């Protein structure tokens, strides 16, 4: 009876973790920030509408210069946008149209995209030939590629539907480390501001804290009821934001190892496709299936505003590194830039 | 005006990119996209053999019409998370082995067919249902009764009646008989008219979509 004894001591360890979490629950976040007062109405207007995609926009990522975006639609093309001018800088034909994710390297020289082909393809935006080539096709995931995030020009973390996250050496195309431990399809990634830890959200209502260098899972964060579709780090890299199908965003803390605030509403029953924080972290922006993007007061869990204006599900959502604008992509084939 | 020379050249680049995007989208709105489904050990691989780790695309042209089939086999992940990627395919080719009624395999096929047919992303997507392995089905139906798969089956243990009973059992899983149609075919090891049946069913789908789209409904 070794297996059942292992099972019961695992349940005992989970009991100890739950007890040590509860013993740290000195006071609720909303039990503390109820005297700061409300941020106020957050009214953003659509400054830009990036037109040109002819199918559902599945992914979007800003450039670290806070001006250039990469956008992935399942019309089989990536498009780099000059958001200040709505100009298309590039248009990258994809070898597999079923793109679900896209990343912009922090240097700006590379753009990744993956999807149902199970490959993360790296594209060289800055070539001597004046086109955009495919520098690498990182194969090795046995499921669809959910999310990809560049650490630098040579490392990239990829999420996949084979329940595993991987870190890649682009120059050799090899998985330097694999992150195993999720029991459902891993759906999204969020790199910490230090690129030393990152967090995954899988279709098991769980979010895990991974170490990139040691390749181990440090903390598991539960509390959701359905698949977590979006993860985002707090600007100081000490907290989460997890969007799931059950129409709730949740704020977890790494150091307290517990959920701090839930962002739910009775008038919201549709899942969350994407979350993102503001530059200070006071606002949490969440894209929804109801075609809307609600802005949440992250300290009080009050709806601060609504980014209505997409005629289909808001599938992707990102705030610039300088906090200046928000970009929402959607299945109606448009990106819109708010301010 | 007010734009610098390099600004204007960037705008011209953006406009040429727009033109290429329009060209590509126009030629893509002319190809027929067929999601190819079915349970394991069916005749899916054989028909895709006769038609031309992740998704497998097989391109194919037949009589002034370019097709694109997407084989989502080996994509053994949660389908709830990517089945909406195929919302908008012209049709769903669903492969079923008739020789799998006694081996339940056919009930697994019917359960997978029920979820895909009633799925919320595929309310107006027709379903070209291929019933494969009919010669094996005939050489099996003499000895192994069809009632092994369907208990309440009352009828002859003959090909023309057992096959029709199976066709009806699959077609009555359609809860959207107003919105989509199921086109059933009986293929075999060497049936060379499968591409023609697909072409006919797809022309019907295209005509009825243009009817619903031109407003006639």
């Amino acid at each position: 009876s070794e297996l059942d004894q292992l099972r019961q001591e695992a349940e005992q360890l989970k009991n100890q973790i739950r007890d040590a979490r509860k013993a740290c629950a000195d006071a609720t976040l909303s039990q503390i920030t109820n005297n700061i007062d409300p941020v106020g109405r957050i009214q953003m207007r659509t400054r830009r509408t990036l037109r040109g995609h002819l199918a559902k926009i599945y992914a979007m990522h800003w450039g670290t210069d806070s001006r250039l975006l990469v956008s992935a639609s399942q019309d089989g093309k990536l498009i780099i946008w000059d958001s200040y001018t709505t100009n298309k800088v590039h248009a990258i034909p994809l070898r597999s149209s079923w793109v679900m994710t896209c990343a912009y390297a922090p240097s700006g020289n590379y753009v990744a995209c993956g999807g149902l082909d199970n490959i993360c393809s790296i594209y060289n935006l800055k070539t001597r030939e004046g086109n955009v080539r495919v520098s690498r096709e990182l194969a090795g995931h046995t499921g669809y590629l959910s999310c990809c995030r560049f650490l630098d020009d040579n490392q990239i973390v990829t999420s996949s539907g084979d329940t595993t996250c991987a870190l890649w050496d682009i120059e050799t195309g090899q998985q330097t480390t694999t992150f195993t431990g999720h029991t459902g399809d891993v759906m999204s990634l969020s790199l910490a501001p230090d690129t030393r830890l990152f967090v995954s959200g899988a279709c098991d209502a769980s979010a895990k804290l991974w170490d990139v260098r040691e390749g181990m899972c440090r903390q598991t964060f539960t509390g959701h009821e359905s698949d977590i579709n979006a993860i985002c780090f707090f600007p100081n890299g000490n907290a989460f934001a997890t969007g799931s199908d059950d129409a709730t965003c949740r704020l977890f803390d790494l150091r307290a190892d517990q959920e701090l605030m839930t962002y739910s509403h009775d008038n919201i029953i549709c899942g969350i496709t994407s979350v993102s924080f503001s530059k200070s972290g006071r606002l949490l922006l969440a894209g929804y299936d109801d075609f809307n993007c609600n802005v949440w007061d992250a300290l009080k869990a009050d709806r601060a505003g609504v980014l209505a204006g997409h005629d289909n599900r808001v599938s992707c959502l990102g705030v610039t590194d300088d906090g200046m604008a928000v970009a929402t992509g959607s299945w109606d084939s448009f990106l819109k830039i708010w301010n | 005006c007010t734009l610098s020379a390099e600004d204007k050249a960037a705008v011209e680049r953006s406009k040429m990119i727009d033109r290429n995007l329009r060209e590509d989208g126009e030629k893509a709105a002319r190809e027929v996209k067929l999601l190819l489904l079915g349970a394991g050990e069916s005749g899916k691989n054989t028909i895709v053999k006769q038609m031309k780790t992740g998704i497998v695309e097989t391109h194919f042209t037949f009589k002034d019409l370019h097709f694109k089939m997407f084989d989502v086999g080996a994509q053994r992940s949660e389908r709830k998370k990517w089945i909406h990627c195929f919302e908008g395919v012209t049709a769903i080719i669903f492969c079923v082995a008739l020789s799998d009624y006694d081996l339940n395999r056919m009930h697994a096929s019917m359960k997978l067919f029920d979820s895909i047919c009633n799925n919320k992303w595929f309310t107006d997507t027709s379903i070209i249902l291929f019933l494969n392995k009919k010669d094996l089905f005939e050489e099996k139906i003499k000895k192994s009764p069809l009632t092994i798969c369907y208990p309440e089956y009352a009828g002859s243990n003959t090909y023309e009646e057992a096959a029709a009973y199976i066709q009806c059992q699959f077609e009555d899983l359609n809860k959207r008989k107003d919105t989509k149609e199921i086109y059933t075919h009986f293929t075999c090891s060497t049936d060379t008219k499968n591409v023609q049946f697909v072409f006919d069913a797809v022309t019907d789908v295209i005509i009825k979509n243009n009817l619903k789209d031109c407003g006639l409904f």
Epitope: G108, E129, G130, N131 | A9, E12
Partner: single-chain antibody, 231 residues
Framework: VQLVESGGGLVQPGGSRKLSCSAS????????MHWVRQAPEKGLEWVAY????????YYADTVKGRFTISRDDPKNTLFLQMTSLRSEDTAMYYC??????????????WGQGTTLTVSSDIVMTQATSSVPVTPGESVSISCRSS???????????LYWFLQRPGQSPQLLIY???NLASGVPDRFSGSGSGTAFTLTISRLEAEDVGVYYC?????????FGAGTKLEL
């Protein structure tokens, strides 16, 4: 990446000749191509331009109505049908590769040049004509303009080119501060809109050449006189 120019040689005055330009090693359809000539021992002089897609074409006032620039992308070749050739057209015609998007590096590659021998613009001023320099020391090549190249969009369209004694001009710095690809970080760019400076921190024997000062704010694109660095 290569541009090979063909079609030079001794021409009668008033005749007509066509310069070809066989491109190689890059997406020739995606670049705007220029023609830049250089009188026997004088400075650079912009001649024509044809955009990517052949949609936009510009000429210098000297060659308007006489020179015709063409683009034949399927053969990756650029043309310049010259007519009514005067002795002022005796020069060295370079094809220049130029691509324009947000953050690009236009004029990054120059051809090798074909020698043709006939028997309200922005004035860029390089008040210095030559500087005797010493390897290892700092050298500042200054440029000036009659109009402020600082645009309303924040870009200062100033370009620095270096032409080593027996070669074609090479882009050093684009938009007044941005170091081109393949050029070492010794070269630095700064300016104020009407006054510009090219700084070379420590000199090597290969930095010896003529440093040209082009503007890209308005057409015609105008070069400086050319500041020579000699040992």
């Amino acid at each position: 990446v290569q541009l090979v120019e063909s079609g030079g040689g001794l021409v009668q005055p008033g005749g007509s000749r066509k310069l070809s330009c066989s491109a190689s090693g890059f997406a020739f359809s995606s670049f705007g191509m220029h023609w830049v000539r250089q009188a026997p021992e004088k400075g650079l002089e912009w001649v024509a331009y044809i955009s990517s897609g052949s949609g936009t074409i510009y000429y210098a006032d000297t060659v308007k109505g006489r020179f015709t620039i063409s683009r034949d992308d399927p053969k990756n070749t650029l043309f310049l049908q010259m007519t009514s050739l005067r002795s002022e057209d005796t020069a060295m015609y370079y094809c220049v590769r130029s691509i324009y998007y947000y953050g690009s590096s236009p004029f990054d590659f120059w051809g090798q040049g074909t020698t043709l021998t006939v028997s309200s613009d922005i004035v860029m001023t390089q008040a210095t004509s030559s500087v005797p320099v010493t390897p290892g020391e700092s050298v500042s090549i200054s440029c000036r303009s009659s109009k402020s190249l600082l645009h309303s969009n924040g870009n200062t369209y100033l370009y620095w080119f270096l032409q080593r004694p027996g070669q074609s001009p090479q882009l050093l710095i684009y938009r007044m501060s941005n170091l081109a690809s393949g050029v070492p970080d010794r070269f630095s760019g700064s300016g104020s809109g009407t006054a510009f400076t090219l700084t070379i921190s420590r000199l090597e024997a290969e930095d010896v050449g003529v440093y040209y000062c082009m503007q890209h704010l308005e057409y015609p694109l105008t070069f400086g006189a050319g500041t020579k660095l000699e040992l």
